[PDB]
Tab-separated table of C-alpha atoms in Angstrom:
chain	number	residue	atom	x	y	z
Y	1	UNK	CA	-9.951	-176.081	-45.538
Y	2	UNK	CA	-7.961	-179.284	-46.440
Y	3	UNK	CA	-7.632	-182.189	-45.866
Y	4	UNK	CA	-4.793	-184.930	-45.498
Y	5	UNK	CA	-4.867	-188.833	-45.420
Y	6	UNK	CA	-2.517	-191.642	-45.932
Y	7	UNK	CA	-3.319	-194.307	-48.582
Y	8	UNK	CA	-2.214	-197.788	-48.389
Y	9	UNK	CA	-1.461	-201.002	-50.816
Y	10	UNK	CA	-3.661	-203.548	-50.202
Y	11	UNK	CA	-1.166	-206.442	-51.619
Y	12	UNK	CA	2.513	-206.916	-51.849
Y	13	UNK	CA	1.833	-205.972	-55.657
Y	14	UNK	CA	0.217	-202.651	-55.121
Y	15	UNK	CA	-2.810	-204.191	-56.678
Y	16	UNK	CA	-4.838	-200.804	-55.605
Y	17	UNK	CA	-4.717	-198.562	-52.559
Y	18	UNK	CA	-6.878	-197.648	-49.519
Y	19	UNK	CA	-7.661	-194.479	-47.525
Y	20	UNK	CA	-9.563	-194.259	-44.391
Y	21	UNK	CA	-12.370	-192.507	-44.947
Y	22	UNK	CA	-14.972	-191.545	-41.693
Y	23	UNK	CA	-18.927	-191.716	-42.879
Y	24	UNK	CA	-21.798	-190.840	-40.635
Y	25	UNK	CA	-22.459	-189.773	-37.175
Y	26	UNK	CA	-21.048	-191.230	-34.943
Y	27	UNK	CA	-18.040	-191.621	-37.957
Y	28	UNK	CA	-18.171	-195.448	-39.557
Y	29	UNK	CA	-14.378	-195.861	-40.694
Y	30	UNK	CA	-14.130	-197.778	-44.051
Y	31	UNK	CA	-11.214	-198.280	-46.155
Y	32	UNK	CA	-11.917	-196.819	-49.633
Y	33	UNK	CA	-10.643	-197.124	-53.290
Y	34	UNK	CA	-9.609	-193.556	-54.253
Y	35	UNK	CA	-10.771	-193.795	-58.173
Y	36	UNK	CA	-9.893	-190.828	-60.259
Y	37	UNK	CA	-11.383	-193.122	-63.073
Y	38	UNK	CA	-15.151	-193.175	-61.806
Y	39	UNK	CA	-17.694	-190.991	-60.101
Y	40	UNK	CA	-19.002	-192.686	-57.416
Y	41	UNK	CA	-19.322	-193.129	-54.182
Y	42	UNK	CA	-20.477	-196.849	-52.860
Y	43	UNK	CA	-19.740	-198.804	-50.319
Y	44	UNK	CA	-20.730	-202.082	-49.322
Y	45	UNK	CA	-23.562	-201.612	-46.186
Y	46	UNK	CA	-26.090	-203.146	-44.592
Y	47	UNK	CA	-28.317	-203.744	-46.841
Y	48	UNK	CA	-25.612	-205.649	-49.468
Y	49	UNK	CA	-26.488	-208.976	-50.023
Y	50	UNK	CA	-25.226	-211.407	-47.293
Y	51	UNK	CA	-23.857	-213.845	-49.842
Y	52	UNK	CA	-22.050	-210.734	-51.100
Y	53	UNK	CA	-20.098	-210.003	-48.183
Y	54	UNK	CA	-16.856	-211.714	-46.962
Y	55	UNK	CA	-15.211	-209.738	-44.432
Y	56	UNK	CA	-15.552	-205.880	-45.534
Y	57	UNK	CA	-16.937	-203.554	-43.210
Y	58	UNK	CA	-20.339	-202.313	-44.068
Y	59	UNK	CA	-21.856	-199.132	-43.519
Y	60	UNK	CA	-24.842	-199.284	-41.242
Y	61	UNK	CA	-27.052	-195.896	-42.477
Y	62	UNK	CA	-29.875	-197.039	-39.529
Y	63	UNK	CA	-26.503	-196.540	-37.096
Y	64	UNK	CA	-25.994	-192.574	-38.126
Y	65	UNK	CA	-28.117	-189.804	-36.925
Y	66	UNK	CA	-26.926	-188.013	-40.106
Y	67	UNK	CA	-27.418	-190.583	-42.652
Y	68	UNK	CA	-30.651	-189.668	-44.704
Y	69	UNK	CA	-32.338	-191.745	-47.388
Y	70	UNK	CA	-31.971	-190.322	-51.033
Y	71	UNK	CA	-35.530	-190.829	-51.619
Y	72	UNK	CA	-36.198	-193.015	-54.965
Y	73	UNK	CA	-32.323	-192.677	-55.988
Y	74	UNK	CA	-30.628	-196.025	-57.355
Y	75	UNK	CA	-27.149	-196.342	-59.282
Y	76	UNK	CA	-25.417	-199.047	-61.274
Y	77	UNK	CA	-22.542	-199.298	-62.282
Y	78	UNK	CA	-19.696	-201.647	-64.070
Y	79	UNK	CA	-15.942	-201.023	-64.428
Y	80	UNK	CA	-13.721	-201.627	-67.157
Y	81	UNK	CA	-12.880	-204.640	-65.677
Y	82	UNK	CA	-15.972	-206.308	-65.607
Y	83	UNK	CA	-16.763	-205.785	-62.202
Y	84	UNK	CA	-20.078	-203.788	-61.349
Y	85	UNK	CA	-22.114	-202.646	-58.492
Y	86	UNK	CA	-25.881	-201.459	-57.818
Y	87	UNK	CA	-28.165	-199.889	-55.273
Y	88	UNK	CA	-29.970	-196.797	-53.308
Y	89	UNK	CA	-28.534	-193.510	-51.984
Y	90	UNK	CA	-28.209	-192.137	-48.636
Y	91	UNK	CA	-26.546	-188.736	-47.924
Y	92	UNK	CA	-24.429	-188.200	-44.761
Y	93	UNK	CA	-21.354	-186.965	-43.449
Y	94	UNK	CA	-18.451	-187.863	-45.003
Y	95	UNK	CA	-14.786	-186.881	-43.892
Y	96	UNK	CA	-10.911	-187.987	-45.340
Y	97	UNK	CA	-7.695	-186.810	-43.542
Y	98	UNK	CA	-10.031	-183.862	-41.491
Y	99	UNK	CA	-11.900	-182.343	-44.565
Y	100	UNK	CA	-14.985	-182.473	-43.696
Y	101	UNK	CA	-18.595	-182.670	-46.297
Y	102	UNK	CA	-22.056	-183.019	-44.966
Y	103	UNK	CA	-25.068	-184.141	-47.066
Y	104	UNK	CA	-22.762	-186.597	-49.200
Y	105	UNK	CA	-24.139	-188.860	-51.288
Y	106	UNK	CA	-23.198	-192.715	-50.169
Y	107	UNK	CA	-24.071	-195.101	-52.427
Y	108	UNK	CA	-25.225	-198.011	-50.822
Y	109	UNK	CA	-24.428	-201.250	-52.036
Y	110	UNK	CA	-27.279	-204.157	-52.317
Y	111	UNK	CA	-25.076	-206.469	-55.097
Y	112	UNK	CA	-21.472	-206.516	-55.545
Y	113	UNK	CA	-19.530	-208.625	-58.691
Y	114	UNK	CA	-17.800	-211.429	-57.148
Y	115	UNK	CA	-14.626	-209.153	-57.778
Y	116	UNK	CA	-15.470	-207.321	-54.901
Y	117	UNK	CA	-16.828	-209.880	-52.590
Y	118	UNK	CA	-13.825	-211.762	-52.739
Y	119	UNK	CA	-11.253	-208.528	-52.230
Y	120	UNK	CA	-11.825	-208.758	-48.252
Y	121	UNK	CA	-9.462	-205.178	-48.289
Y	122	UNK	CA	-12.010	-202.980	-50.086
Y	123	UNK	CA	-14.828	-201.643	-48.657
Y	124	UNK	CA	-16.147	-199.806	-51.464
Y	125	UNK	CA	-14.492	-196.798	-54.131
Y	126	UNK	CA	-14.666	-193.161	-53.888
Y	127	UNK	CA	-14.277	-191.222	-56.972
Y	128	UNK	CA	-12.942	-188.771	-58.143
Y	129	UNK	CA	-13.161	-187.999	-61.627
Y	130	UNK	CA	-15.833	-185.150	-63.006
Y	131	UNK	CA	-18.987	-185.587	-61.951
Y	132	UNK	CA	-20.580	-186.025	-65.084
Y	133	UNK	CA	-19.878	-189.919	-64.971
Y	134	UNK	CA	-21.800	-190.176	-61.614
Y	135	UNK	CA	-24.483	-192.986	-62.195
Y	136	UNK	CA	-27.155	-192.036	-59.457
Y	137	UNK	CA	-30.709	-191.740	-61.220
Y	138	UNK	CA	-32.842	-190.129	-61.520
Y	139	UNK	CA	-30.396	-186.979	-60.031
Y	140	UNK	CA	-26.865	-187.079	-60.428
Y	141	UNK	CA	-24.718	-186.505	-57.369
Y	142	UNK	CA	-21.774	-184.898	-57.018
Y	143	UNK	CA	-18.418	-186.401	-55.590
Y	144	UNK	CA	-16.275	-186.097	-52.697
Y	145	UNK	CA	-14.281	-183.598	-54.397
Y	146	UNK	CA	-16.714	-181.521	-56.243
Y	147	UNK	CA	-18.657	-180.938	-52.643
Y	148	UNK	CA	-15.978	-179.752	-50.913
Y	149	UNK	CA	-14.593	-177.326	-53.752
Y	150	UNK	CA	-15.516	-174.603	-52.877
Y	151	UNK	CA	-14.526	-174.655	-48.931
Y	152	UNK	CA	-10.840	-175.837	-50.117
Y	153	UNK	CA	-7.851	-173.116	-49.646
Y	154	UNK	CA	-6.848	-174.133	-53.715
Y	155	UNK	CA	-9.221	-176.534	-55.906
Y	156	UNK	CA	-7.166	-179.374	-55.851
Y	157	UNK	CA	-6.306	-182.625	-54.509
Y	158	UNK	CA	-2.882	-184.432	-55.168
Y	159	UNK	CA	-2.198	-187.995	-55.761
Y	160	UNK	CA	1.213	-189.814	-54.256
Y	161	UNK	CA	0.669	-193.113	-54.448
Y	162	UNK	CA	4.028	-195.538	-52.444
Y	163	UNK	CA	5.803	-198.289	-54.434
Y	164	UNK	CA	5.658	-201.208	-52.073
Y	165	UNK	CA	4.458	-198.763	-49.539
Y	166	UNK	CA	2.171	-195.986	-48.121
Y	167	UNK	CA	1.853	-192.538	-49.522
Y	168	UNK	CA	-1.160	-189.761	-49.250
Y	169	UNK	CA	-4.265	-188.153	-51.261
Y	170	UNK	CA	-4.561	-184.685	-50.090
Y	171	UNK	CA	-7.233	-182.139	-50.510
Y	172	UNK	CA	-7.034	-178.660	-51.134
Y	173	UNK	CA	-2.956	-177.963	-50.797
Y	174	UNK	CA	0.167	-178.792	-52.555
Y	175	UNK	CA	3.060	-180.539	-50.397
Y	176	UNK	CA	5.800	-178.520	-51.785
Y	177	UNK	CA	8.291	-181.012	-50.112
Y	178	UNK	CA	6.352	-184.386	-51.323
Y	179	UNK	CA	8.315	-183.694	-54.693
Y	180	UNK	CA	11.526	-182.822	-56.431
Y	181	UNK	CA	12.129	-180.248	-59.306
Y	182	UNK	CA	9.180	-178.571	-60.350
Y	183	UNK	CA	5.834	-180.005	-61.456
Y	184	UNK	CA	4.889	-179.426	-64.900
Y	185	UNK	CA	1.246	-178.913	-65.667
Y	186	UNK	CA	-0.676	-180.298	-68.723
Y	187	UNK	CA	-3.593	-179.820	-70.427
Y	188	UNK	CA	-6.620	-181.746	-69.904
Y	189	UNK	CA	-10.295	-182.851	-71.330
Y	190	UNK	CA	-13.160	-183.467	-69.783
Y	191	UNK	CA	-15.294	-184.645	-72.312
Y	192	UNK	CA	-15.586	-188.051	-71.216
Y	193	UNK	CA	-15.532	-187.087	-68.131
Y	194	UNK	CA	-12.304	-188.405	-67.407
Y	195	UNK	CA	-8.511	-187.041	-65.978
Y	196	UNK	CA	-7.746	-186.849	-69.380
Y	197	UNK	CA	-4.346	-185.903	-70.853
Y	198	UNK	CA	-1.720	-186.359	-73.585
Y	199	UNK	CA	1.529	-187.537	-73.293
Y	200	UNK	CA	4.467	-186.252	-75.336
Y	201	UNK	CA	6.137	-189.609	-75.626
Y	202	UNK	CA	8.134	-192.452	-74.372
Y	203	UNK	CA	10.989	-193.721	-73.744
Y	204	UNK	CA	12.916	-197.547	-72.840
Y	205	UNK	CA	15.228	-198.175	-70.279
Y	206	UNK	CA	18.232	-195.981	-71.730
Y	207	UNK	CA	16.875	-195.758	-74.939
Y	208	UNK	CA	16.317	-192.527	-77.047
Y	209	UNK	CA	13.351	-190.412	-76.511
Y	210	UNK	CA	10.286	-190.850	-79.304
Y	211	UNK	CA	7.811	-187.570	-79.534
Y	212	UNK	CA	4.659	-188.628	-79.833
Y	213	UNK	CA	1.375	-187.870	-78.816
Y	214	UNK	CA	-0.528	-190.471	-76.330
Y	215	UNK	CA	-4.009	-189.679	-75.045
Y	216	UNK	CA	-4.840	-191.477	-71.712
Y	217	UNK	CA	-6.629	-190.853	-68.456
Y	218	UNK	CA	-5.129	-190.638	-65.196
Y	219	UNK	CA	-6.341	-193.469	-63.022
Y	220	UNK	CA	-5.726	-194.146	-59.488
Y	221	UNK	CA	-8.213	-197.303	-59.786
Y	222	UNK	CA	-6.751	-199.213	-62.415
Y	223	UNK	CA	-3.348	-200.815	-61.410
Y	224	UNK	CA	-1.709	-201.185	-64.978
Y	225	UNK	CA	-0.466	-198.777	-67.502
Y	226	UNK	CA	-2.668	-199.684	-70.653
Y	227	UNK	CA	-1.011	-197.897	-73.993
Y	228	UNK	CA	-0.870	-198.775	-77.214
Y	229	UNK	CA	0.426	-202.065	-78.867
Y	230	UNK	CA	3.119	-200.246	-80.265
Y	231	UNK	CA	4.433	-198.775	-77.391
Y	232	UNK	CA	4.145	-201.835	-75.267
Y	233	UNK	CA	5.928	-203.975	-77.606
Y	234	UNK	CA	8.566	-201.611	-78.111
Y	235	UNK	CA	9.052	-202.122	-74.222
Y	236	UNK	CA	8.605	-205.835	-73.740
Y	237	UNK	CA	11.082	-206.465	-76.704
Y	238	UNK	CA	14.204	-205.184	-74.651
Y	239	UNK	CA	12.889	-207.785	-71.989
Y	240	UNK	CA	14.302	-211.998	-72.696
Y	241	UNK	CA	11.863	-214.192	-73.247
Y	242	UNK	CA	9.059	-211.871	-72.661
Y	243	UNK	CA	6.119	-212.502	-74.951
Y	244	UNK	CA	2.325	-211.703	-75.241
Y	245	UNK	CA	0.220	-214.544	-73.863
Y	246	UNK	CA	-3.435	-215.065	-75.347
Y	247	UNK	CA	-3.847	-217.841	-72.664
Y	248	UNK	CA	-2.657	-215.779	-69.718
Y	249	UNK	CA	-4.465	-212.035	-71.110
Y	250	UNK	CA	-0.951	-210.117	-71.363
Y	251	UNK	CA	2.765	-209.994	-71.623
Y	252	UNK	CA	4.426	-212.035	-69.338
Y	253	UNK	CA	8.066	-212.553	-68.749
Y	254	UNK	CA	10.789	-214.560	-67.118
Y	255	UNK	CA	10.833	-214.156	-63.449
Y	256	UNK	CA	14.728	-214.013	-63.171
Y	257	UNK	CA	14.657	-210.893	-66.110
Y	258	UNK	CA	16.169	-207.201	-64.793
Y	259	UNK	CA	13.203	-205.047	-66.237
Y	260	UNK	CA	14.338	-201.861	-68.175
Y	261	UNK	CA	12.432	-198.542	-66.849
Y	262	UNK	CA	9.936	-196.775	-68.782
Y	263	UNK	CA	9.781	-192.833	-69.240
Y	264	UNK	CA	6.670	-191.288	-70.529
Y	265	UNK	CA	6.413	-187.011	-71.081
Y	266	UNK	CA	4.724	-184.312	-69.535
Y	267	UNK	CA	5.545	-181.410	-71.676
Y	268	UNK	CA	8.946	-181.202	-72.249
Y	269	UNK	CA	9.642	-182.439	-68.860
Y	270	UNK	CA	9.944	-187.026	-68.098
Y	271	UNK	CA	8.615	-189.346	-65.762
Y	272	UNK	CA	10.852	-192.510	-65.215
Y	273	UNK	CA	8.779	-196.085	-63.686
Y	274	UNK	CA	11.542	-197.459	-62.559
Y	275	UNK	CA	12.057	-201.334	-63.929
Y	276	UNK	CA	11.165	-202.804	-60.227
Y	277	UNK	CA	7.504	-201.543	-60.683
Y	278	UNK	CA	6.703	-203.042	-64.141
Y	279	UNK	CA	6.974	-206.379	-61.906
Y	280	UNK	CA	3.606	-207.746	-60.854
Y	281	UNK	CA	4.953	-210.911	-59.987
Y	282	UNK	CA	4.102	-214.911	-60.749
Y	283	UNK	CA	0.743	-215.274	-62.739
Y	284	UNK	CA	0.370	-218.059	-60.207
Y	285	UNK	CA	1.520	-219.449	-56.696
Y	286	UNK	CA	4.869	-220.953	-57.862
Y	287	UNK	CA	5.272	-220.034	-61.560
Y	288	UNK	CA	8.471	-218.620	-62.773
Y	289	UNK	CA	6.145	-216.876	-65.627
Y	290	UNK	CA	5.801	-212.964	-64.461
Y	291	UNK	CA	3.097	-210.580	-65.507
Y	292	UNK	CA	3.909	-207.325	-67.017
Y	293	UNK	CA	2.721	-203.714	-65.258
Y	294	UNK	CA	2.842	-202.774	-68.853
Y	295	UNK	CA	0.258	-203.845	-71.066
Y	296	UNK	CA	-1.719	-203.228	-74.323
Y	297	UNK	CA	-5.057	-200.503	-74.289
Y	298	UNK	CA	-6.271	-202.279	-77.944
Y	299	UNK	CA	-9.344	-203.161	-77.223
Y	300	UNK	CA	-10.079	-200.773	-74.067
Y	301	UNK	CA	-10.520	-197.928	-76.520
Y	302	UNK	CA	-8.366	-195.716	-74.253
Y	303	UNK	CA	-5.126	-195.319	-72.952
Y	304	UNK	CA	-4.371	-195.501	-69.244
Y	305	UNK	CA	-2.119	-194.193	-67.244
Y	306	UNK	CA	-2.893	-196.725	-63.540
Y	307	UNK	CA	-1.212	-196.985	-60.601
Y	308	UNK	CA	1.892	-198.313	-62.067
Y	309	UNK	CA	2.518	-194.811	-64.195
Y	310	UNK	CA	1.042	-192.288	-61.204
Y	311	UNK	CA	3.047	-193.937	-58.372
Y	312	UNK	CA	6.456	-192.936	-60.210
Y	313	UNK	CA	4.720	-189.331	-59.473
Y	314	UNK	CA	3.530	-186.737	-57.854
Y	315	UNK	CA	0.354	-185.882	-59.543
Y	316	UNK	CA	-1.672	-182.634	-59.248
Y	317	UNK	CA	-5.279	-183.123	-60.138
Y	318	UNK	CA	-6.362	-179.137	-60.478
Y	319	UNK	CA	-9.995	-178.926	-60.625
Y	320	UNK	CA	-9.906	-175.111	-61.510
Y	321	UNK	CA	-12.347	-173.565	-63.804
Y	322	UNK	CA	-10.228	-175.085	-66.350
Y	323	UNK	CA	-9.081	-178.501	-65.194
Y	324	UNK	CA	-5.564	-179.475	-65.198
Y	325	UNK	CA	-3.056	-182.055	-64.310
Y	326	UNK	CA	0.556	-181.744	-62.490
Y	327	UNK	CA	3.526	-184.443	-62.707
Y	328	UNK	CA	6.353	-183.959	-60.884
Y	329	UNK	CA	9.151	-186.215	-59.799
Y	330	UNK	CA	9.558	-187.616	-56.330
């Protein structure tokens, strides 16, 4: 099988991206956060706090003949962000772009961080990294991807996320016309149970290539690319004016500035953001202060490749015996 949906900003920014995703019987459409970072599941229901809710849709489980308490099953969790989330476990039916899994497990949500009360657009994340992150106690559940597996034609889904614009998750097939060239495949870890890679360097604007090795994650749920201090001021120096702002929690830059691309490797082969993307706009209604899509990991404790790095790509996430990521230009 496979399966096939389109994925959507939520912002003029591309802040993060949602997919349709059908739960229950009869189907309960909410828009989800595709997160290759995380391991769960949740959405915000029927039984999330009232207070907690401002203007998502909820899954109603009492509404589904398939829906089926987890019996004594909570999670928790809390993103890198500082946002977090908590409650039970139902299973059910859960279905994106025609690919179909029953006896899901759908986190439901009883308390949401503020963060996700007040982003109206997001009805709760799907992930999709390795299961081994999943926080349900006192059994860990599986995601999305991990249940349907084995029913897939190939054990893979693909990530091509739109600047400024839609693109499409799919399950279980490559799009040999979603991409130019050829996609070169790299290595990855699971250990922390993470889309985890390394990089064979970087490049700025026209600037000479530097080899060097950068671990990092691929993750469709964090907007930014996060790399090292190095690296990021090596990027924000070709930029006037630009400058690291304590007060503000980045680099920011002039608002009239032409931003220079950035090229990281795959291999031997190169991925080029172009400049436009590396724009996230005023840090407030009116500024002429701009806040960098590039910006510092010191102090995450890993390197991370967002939404910023993967929509410049095609990406391959190949959950074969031996896990393994695909770049390709587009």
């Amino acid at each position: 099988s496979t399966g096939s949906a389109t994925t959507t900003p939520i912002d003029s920014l591309d802040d993060a991206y949602i997919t349709p995703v059908q739960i229950g019987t009869p189907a309960q459409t909410l828009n989800l956060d595709f997160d290759t970072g995380s391991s769960d599941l949740w959405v915000f229901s029927s039984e999330t706090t009232a207070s907690e809710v401002d203007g998502q849709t909820i899954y109603t489980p009492s509404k589904s003949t398939t829906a089926k308490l987890l019996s004594g099953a909570t999670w928790s969790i809390s993103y890198g962000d500082g946002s977090s989330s908590s409650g039970d476990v139902y299973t059910d039916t859960v279905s994106v772009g025609g690919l179909t899994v029953t006896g899901q497990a759908v986190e439901s949500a009883k308390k949401v961080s503020s963060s996700f009360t007040e982003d109206s657009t997001i009805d709760g994340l799907l992930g999709l990294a390795f299961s081994t992150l999943n926080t349900v106690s006192p059994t860990q559940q599986k995601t999305f991807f991990d249940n349907a597996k084995a029913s897939l034609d190939s054990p893979v889904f693909t990530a091509d996320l739109g600047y400024h614009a839609p693109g499409t998750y799919n399950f279980g097939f490559i799009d040999t016309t979603a991409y130019t060239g050829s996609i070169t495949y790299t290595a990855v870890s699971t250990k922390q149970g993470f889309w985890e890679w390394t990089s064979t360097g970087y490049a700025v604007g026209s600037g000479t290539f530097k080899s060097t090795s950068i671990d990092g994650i691929a993750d469709t749920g964090t907007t930014l690319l996060y790399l090292p201090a190095t690296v990021v001021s090596a990027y924000w120096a070709q930029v006037s004016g630009a400058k690291s702002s304590s007060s503000v929690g980045g680099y920011v830059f002039p608002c009239s500035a032409t931003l220079p691309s950035f090229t990281f490797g795959v291999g031997s082969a190169r991925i080029v953001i172009p400049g436009d993307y590396i724009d996230f706009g005023p840090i407030s209604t009116g500024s002429s202060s701009c806040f960098g899509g590039i910006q510092s990991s010191a102090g995450i404790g890993i390197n991370i490749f967002g939404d910023v790095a993967l929509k410049a790509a095609f990406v391959v996430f190949n959950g074969a015996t031996t896990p393994t990521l695909g770049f390709a230009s587009k």
